[PDB]
Nucleic acid binder design. Structure first.
Lengths: 281, 465, 51
DNA sequence: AAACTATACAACCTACTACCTCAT
RNA sequence: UGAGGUAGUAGGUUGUAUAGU
């Protein structure tokens, strides 16, 4: 049996609500500042919640009426049945995955966990002291090696065309004291390559599962407060498959041989590694 | 809830008309299909390079073993595994003086340092091949530690690439001279010492594997085919298209697409693409103008006609990005009506890590995943029972195939890809992540897009890796 | 096809170029190294296409 | 010869393709 | 040989400086 890194949609919310504020939306207003995910699709605001929850920062929304706020059934969106000249199906799926990405980001930023900047995404980690006894589901998640503190991480980005699922890309973040991150990204990459041989796939799965269970709030899902009334449930259980044929498990010696093969990849290639070792001291 | 259909490992044909999965073990068992009678090695370097190359080849004359040879199999000796002889005698050497090296090195500009070194090496190879009454089939230049560490572009104390061997091969294309590049750190790990003491290229436990790789590369560059493929249906051509990006300064470089063609033999009948200033990188989706499309298709068709004396009943096209429809409309206008066009896009960046629920080893290589009838996930990476270890680190990642247009069985393209991904020649390994026509794609694009002076290169493959 | 040409000089040119680019194509694609190429010219070509 | 209110490319707002790096 | 790091484009948003009837 194998379990993947995917996390499907338990129950997709019914209503996709478009808010045609038109002249009620300031031009200089930043769309990212909203507590709910939204986009300025033409003169509409493609949202997931009601119209009257943005009155805290937008003092013009209260003049907007309900019946111009159109709704779209997401069953036809996921099935491809949705056929309207306003939005076609595929870019609707694209805006949907954009919305759920932003919603997950804001929900998990609301739980007060730290953040590290990647190139085209973001990876996240639990700071020291927040998790008691440094254990979660009998799995180590954030530890200490040599003198640098390593923090396990994830990176999520959805895609729905085979099924409404969400992937997670496992990362690991490093720091020297558990307070501030490493100044140089190359040192982080070096520590990642150093710690790669320290553990192996089973520990990767354990850390990933511990992270998923830690970011969850309920038992068999996570709670995405996409709207004030409507939430999104993510199957925290990873998607599991199986193969008809497989191998026979060997002893632990071949794990050491895999670490040896990591050292073979160390020997076979090298590219300006000498400066970062000689000039670091 | 959904199954992972497995594809059997295609066996490579060996000597005496027999087949085995692992190339190293079976090659030690049977040997090459067509033996050569031996080749002369021309080493170009210093006296230190001479003695270290002679010592290394004398070391690989005798049989040597790895730490555990289920994973990295035995090296019984070059004569004991290939048949063709190799000795320290009758080896031609060309003097590389320090005076030229020092006079070139004292210049501050690293790019012109690379320029003058490649000019010196090419000129010495030319004056070794144009007047010497002897004959050399394979050349083995040696680069010391200081040259490699000082020729780095960003080492701090325009028509050519900064790296060495790419433009050495590119300027050596026209004279049809095969050669191999060997770092000093590669074959001299015994005396290559860092600050700590350990060898940087720590080839100590796998000197058998190093001998395997070097000997297989030499036998490939000699002229004798190491292995072929087992099952090939008549009338199929694997055209793995390259789209390596070219950055030749400020001129419009655009697209420099190339291809490797597999019709009935393991070697790729590679035809060079155009310098090709079309399709402005604003539309950098790497499509094909129709006229170059029919040019490439006709090149492949007449290559098949000249090497098989028939018409190809099916065409395979491999790439990394997706395909349009106008290029296939231009394609089908020149194809015979009995042909079939298949365009398969291969990606790696898709995140999908099938973790193991319980056990001590991850998902094996070859367990494919089917999504639709046109696209699928194939695991060419991971565990294999023959080698009894994984080829990856942590958790492997699969490749995602996708038939863009054209109707085909997904199992057929899956088996074709799995058969294609087991012909890595420069590295003697059981299997790699990417297929061979894509693994060699970066190399062939780098070579063919390093010197603009090449117009019609040699279409044999031995002058590239 | 090349026989019935009027002047034998262009016949010599086209035949020589055909042999030349045949050899170039042969050694630029075939992986098997060929140290010496043996051009077996027919006797009637040497006889009837004299200068 | 000039009224209303659109065009003509065309810069730029979140994310999807490739080249160079670091290290086992 | 696989996971992080920078430039910036797949394809639709709305700011520049004109011109269709």
């Amino acid at each position: 049996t194998y379990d993947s890194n995917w996390f499907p949609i338990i129950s997709f919310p019914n209503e996709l609500r478009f808010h045609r504020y038109d002249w009620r939306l300031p031009k200089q207003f930043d769309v990212r500042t909203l507590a709910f995910p939204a986009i300025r699709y033409k003169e509409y605001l493609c949202t997931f919640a009601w119209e009257y929850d943005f009155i805290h920062q937008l003092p013009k929304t209260e003049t907007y009426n309900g019946q111009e706020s159109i709704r779209i059934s997401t069953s036809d969106i996921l099935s491809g049945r949705y056929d309207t000249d306003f939005i076609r199906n595929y870019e609707c799926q694209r805006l949907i995955v954009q919305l759920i990405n932003k919603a997950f980001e804001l929900r998990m930023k609301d739980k007060n966990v730290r953040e590290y900047q990647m190139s085209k995404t973001f990876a996240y980690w639990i700071e020291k002291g927040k998790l008691e006894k440094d254990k979660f589901e009998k799995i180590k998640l954030v530890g200490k090696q040599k003198n640098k503190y390593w923090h396990f991480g994830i990176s999520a980005a959805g895609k729905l065309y085979p099924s409404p699922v969400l992937m997670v890309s496992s990362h690991i973040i490093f720091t020297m004291d558990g307070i501030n991150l490493i100044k140089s990204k190359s040192i982080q990459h070096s520590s990642r390559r150093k710690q790669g041989k320290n553990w192996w796939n089973d520990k990767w799965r354990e850390k990933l599962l511990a992270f998923i269970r830690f970011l969850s709030d309920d038992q068999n899902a996570i709670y995405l407060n996409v709207g004030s009334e409507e939430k999104i449930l993510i199957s925290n259980k990873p998607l599991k498959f199986f193969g008809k044929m497989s191998y026979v498990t060997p002893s632990e010696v071949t794990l050491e041989e895999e670490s040896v093969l990591a050292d073979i990849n160390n020997f076979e290639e090298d590219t300006e590694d000498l400066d970062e070792l000689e000039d670091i001291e | 809830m959904k199954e992972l259909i497995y594809i059997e490992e295609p066996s490579i044909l060996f000597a005496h008309g027999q087949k085995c999965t692992d190339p190293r073990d079976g090659l030690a068992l049977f040997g090459p299909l067509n033996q050569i009678y031996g080749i002369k090695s021309g080493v170009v370097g210093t006296q230190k390079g001479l003695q270290i190359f002679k010592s290394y080849l004398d070391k690989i004359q005798k049989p040597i073993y790895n730490h555990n040879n289920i994973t990295r199999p035995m090296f019984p000796g070059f004569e004991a595994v290939f048949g063709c002889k190799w000795e320290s005698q009758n080896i031609v050497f060309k003097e590389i003086t320090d005076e030229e090296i020092r006079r070139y090195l004292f210049n501050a500009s690293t790019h012109k340092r690379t320029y003058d070194l490649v000019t010196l090496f090419n000129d010495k190879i030319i004056t070794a091949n144009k007047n010497d009454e002897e004959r050399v089939d394979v050349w083995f230049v040696i680069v010391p530690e200081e040259i490699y560490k000082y020729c780095r572009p960003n080492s701090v104390l325009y028509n050519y690439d900064a790296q060495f061997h790419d433009q050495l091969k590119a300027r050596l294309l026209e004279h049809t001279i095969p050669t191999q590049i060997l770092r000093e750190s590669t074959l001299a790990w015994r005396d290559f010492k860092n600050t700590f003491g350990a060898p940087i290229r720590d080839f100590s436990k796998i000197e058998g594997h190093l001998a395997w790789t070097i000997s297989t590369a030499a036998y490939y560059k000699a002229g004798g085919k190491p292995w072929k493929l087992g099952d090939i249906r008549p009338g199929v051509c694997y055209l793995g298209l390259v789209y390596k990006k070219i950055e030749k300064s400020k001129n419009p470089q655009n697209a420099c697409c190339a291809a490797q063609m597999f019709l009935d033999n393991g070697d790729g009948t590679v035809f060079k693409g155009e310098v090709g200033p079309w399709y402005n990188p604003e539309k950098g989706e790497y499509h094909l103008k129709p006229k170059e499309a029919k040019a490439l298709l006709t090149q492949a068709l007449e290559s098949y006609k000249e090497q098989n004396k028939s018409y190809p009943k099916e065409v395979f096209i491999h790439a990394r990005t997706r395909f349009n429809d106008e290029e296939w409309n231009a394609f089908n206008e020149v194809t015979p009506k009995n042909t079939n066009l298949v365009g398969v896009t291969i990606t790696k960046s898709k995140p999908l890590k099938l973790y193991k629920t319980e056990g001590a080893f991850p998902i094996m290589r070859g367990n494919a995943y089917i999504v639709d009838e046109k696209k699928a996930f194939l695991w060419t990476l991971g565990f294999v029972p023959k080698l009894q270890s994984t080829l990856s680190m942590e958790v492997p990642n699969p490749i995602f195939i996708e038939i863009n247009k054209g109707e085909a069985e997904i199992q057929q393209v899956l088996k074709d890809i799995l058969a294609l991904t087991k012909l890595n020649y420069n590295a003697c390994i059981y299997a790699d992540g990417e297929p061979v026509t894509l693994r060699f794609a970066n190399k062939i694009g780098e070579i063919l897009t390093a010197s603009t002076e090449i117009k019609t290169p040699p279409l044999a493959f031995k002058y590239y890796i």
